[PDB]
Structures are given as structure tokens and as C-alpha cells.
A paper describes a structure:
Based on the structure-function knowledge of the [name] A superfamily we have engineered a chimera that combines [name] 1 highest catalytic activity with [name] 3 unique antipathogen properties. Based on the [name] 1 scaffold we incorporated specific regions essential for [name] 3 unique anti-pathogen activities within the [name] A superfamily. The solved crystal structures confirmed that all the chimera proteins reproduce the kidney-shaped folding typical of the [name] A superfamily and thus keep the fold of the templates used in their design, as suggested by circular dichroism and molecular dynamics analysis. Nonetheless, the structures that incorporated the key features related to [name] 3 antimicrobial activity retained the overall [name] 1 active site conformation together with the essential structural elements for binding to the human ribonuclease inhibitor (RNHI), ensuring non-cytotoxicity.
A first [name] hybrid construct was engineered to combine the high catalytic activity of human [name] 1 and the antimicrobial properties of [name] 3. Briefly, we incorporated the N-terminus of [name] 3 (1–45) that encompasses the main antimicrobial region of the protein and consists of the first two helices, which include an aggregation prone and a lipopolysaccharide (LPS) binding sequence. On the other hand, the hybrid construct conserved the flexible loop L1, ranging from residues 17 to 26 of [name] 1 and reported essential for the protein catalytic activity. A first construct ([name] 3/1-v1) was successfully designed with a catalytic activity 40-fold higher than [name] 3, but alas in detriment of its anti-pathogenic activity. The first version of [name] 3/1-v1 has twelve peptide chains in the asymmetric unit. The maximum RMSD deviation among backbone chains was 0.7, being the highest variation located within the last five C-terminal residues, suggesting that this region has a higher flexibility in solution. To note, the last beta strand was interrupted in residue Phe123, turning the C-terminal tail towards the active site cavity and, in particular, to the B2 region. We should also bear in mind that in the original [name] 1 structure the C-terminal beta strand includes two residues (Phe123 and Ser126) that are directly involved in the B1 cavity. Here, the location of these residues is displaced from their original position, suggesting an impact in the B1 base binding and selectivity, as later discussed. Surprisingly, the R1-L1 (D17-R27), predicted as highly flexible in [name] A studies, is here perfectly superposed between the twelve chains.
Numbering used by the authors: 0 to 124
The structure:
């Protein structure tokens, strides 16, 4: 659930943009990074992906390959290049505030929904 104090665009950046950061991370990266998200949530988010490119690279995906959204609703775009991502997966038995995560680096195209003025990512697809 998006905290009401954040726009869709702000919440996307909080959850998914680690702007201009190292693609390689420690194995504790996700456990530490997810606290900022889960502090606003009722229960630990089960999976989450962070992108490491500079912010403007992620915003540029809104001007790259148009594709259909998974839900069929909205304007979705696939990145021209593979992004540097980190996938976070909640460990079994975790219960807030004891949320620990597996950390997995990766390099793949991302798909985002874009909306608004400015026209920026609002949903990781």
C-alpha cells in the first residue's frame, strides 16, 4: 500500500531507485535497504527490485520501447538496455520488524509504467 504522503512517482523511487550506486552489493544490502520501505508498510514486502543506474536513466525508460502492461492498463515501456538490478526476497519466517532478505544481483531489461507531469515511472512491472 502506498503511504498517502507519497505520490506514485515518489513511492516508485523510494522502492526501486538506488540512484547511481554500485551494481555489486554485500549479501546484507537487501536487509538494510528494505527497512526504509517496510517502515511504511503493515507487513514486510515479500519481493522487491532495486535499480542501480542514475535516476535519469530510469526515467528515460519512459521514452524507450512501448510494450503492453501486465494488467493491460496504462502505458508501459521496456528499457533499451539491460539495467543493473538487485532482487530482494524475504526469508521464511520473517515477521515485521524482523524482516531479513536474500540479496541477488542481476542485469536485465526492466518494464515500467509511466504517467504524469513530469512523465516518470510509477509502477515496476
Amino acid at each position: 500500500m502506498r503511504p498517502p504522503q507519497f505520490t506514485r512517482a515518489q513511492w516508485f523511487a523510494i522502492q526501486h531507485i538506488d540512484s547511481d550506486s554500485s551494481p555489486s552489493s554485500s549479501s546484507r544490502y537487501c536487509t538494510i535497504a528494505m527497512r526504509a520501505i517496510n517502515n511504511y508498510r503493515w507487513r514486510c514486502k515479500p519481493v522487491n527490485t532495486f535499480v542501480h543506474e542514475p535516476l535519469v536513466d530510469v526515467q528515460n525508460v519512459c521514452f524507450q520501447e512501448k510494450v503492453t502492461c501486465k494488467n493491460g492498463q496504462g502505458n508501459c515501456y521496456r528499457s533499451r538496455f539491460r539495467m543493473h538490478i538487485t532482487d530482494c526476497r524475504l526469508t521464511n519466517g520473517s515477521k515485521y520488524p524482523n524482516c531479513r532478505y536474500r540479496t541477488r544481483p542481476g542485469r536485465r531489461h526492466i518494464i515500467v509504467a509511466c504517467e504524469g507531469s513530469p512523465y516518470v515511472p510509477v509502477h515496476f512491472d
